[PDB]
Amino acid sequence: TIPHLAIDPFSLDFFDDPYPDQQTLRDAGPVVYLDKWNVYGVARYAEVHAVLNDPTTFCSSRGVGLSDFKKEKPWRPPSLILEADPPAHTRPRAVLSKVLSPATMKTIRDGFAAAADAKVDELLQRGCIDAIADLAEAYPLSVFPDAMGLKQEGREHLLPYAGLVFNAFGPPNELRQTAIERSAPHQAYVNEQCQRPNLAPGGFGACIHAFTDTGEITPDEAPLLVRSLLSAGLDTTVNGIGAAVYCLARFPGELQRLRSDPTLARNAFEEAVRFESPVQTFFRTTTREVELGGAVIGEGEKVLMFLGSANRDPRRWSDPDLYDITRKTSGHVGFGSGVHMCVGQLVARLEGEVMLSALARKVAAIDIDGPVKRRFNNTLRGLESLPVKLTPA
């Protein structure tokens, strides 16, 4: 009943151009079996959405990578939020939700915006820049570690640590095994900075620790929650902003619409998240026999959700392959959906918004003027290098 496919969604060939293979995965059926890794796959919007929204049947506590925590040792202590199910999940989630709240956004907004304006000003002085190193990396590096309350020393460990985390959700290919074999210094650094004494007052980190006396989390839980933010909070935004600039570079008509109305910045970023889906994939594990899209899946099976594919499913989206900054994006699954839906999305959107606003007001054109190089990662989609010429407005 379930078609079997030999496509490796974690191969460099796939990362290099995933879209044909994603259509093959969607059109093969609502549920496929991926023989390469012995997992089920869902690539259409409807099934991806259904799976995300049934956490009881499709759990996270057995890991959201290929590895089944019931069978293998997790490479690091499990995340108390990403790799937990309700009810264990519920209070740590509530804490990070309050730490990364509307009120918090109000306190950091002017600073994040000034930094974005300053960066664009600097880049315009240079003219010819690398929009990855000099913008998509440099801008989040200039605001997020400080917002966390990290010391200056050791920050060069943060992106390596993130690349390791997102590679480790993958199968045991070379990407994953190389990451893990280089991991020790990055782990050591990150774990140390998660301790209360090492986090500056007023940062996200200290704020997590301040929540330890409410009964929601205990003091021994706070370091792992800080670890979640240091895992997820940077490299995601790097690839989101990189995606947005790439889109604007490839669709000059949309840059021009954004210039004429900079208040489109926020949606222009959201559309970039749907269109590129910097977070491509996550797994769930079935806790029982389940029927999905008229197909039956046994208990304890890994299920691979293609978020990027769901965000380009023509069953859900009109002209999915077009970057449209006035699209109604609501419902896209680039931040996930349901109880695990990105708890940091207000930070991601804030960063993305103020950067695209700065570009909207200051830049007249973005032209690719060098070879584009992709960055390969088992979970993240994005570029290594994006050489562009920026023309001032």
Ligand X SMILES: CCOc1ccc(C(=O)O)cc1
Binding site for ligand X (CB under 6 A): 79, 81-82, 165, 227-228, 231-232, 236, 279
Report d(CA 53, CA 169) in Å as an integer: 20
**Closest CB to ligand X among residues 204, 251:** 204
- DSSP 8-state code for residue 3: P
Task: Tell me, residue by residue from 176 to 195, as one string, x for binding to Cl ion by CB under 5 A and - for no binding.
Answer: -----------x--------
Alpha-carbon distance 12 to 39, whole Å?
A: 19
Establish how many alpha carbons lie within 13 A of residue 109's alpha carbon, considering only the half-sphere containing its beta carbon: 12
Q: Whose Cβ is closer to ligand HEM: residue 183's or residue 285's?
A: 285
Residue nearest to ligand HEM (CB): 344
Least CB distance to ligand X at residue 226 (A): 10
Cβ nearer to ligand X, comparing 74 with 172: 74
Establish if 65 lies at the interface with ligand HEM (CB under 6 A).
no
Q: Shortest approach of ligand X to residue 242 CB, angstroms?
A: 15
| Cα 374 to Cα 376: distance, rounded to the nearest angstrom | 6
Q: How far is CA 196 from CA 151, 191, 217, 341, in A?
A: 12, 11, 14, 27
Amino acid 243 reads: A
- In the list 143, 194, 229, 292, the residue contacting ligand HEM (rule: CB under 6 A) is 229
Determine which residue in the list 40, 161, 166, 282 makes contact with ligand HEM, applying CB under 6 A.
282
Residue 76 sits in the site that holds Cl ion (CB under 5 A): yes
Between CA 255 and CA 259 the distance in angstroms is: 6
Q: Which member of 82, 141, 217, 325 binds ligand HEM (CB under 6 A)?
A: 82
Burial zone of 130 (CB within 10 Å; 0-12 exposed, 13-18 middle, 19+ buried): buried
Q: Per DSSP, which regions of the chain are E strands?
A: 4-5, 32-34, 39-42, 58-59, 128-130, 281-286, 290-292, 295-297, 302-306, 363-368, 373-375, 382-385, 387-392
Q: Is 347 in the site for ligand HEM (CB under 6 A)?
A: yes
When the beta carbons of 186 and 340 are compared against Cl ion, the nearer one is 186
Which of ligand HEM, ligand X, Cl ion, none does residue 340 bind to, with CB < 5 to 8 Å depending on kind? Answer: ligand HEM
Taking the C-alpha atoms of residue 46 and residue 25, their distance in angstroms, rounded to an integer, is 14
Q: Exactly one of 237, 285, 357, 377 binds ligand HEM (CB under 6 A); which one?
A: 237
Q: Does 193 bind ligand HEM (CB under 6 A)?
A: no
* Terminal C-alpha separation, the chain: 57
Interface positions with ligand HEM (CB under 6 A): 60, 64, 81-82, 93, 96, 100, 228-229, 232-233, 236-237, 240, 273, 278-279, 282, 334-336, 340, 342-344, 347-348
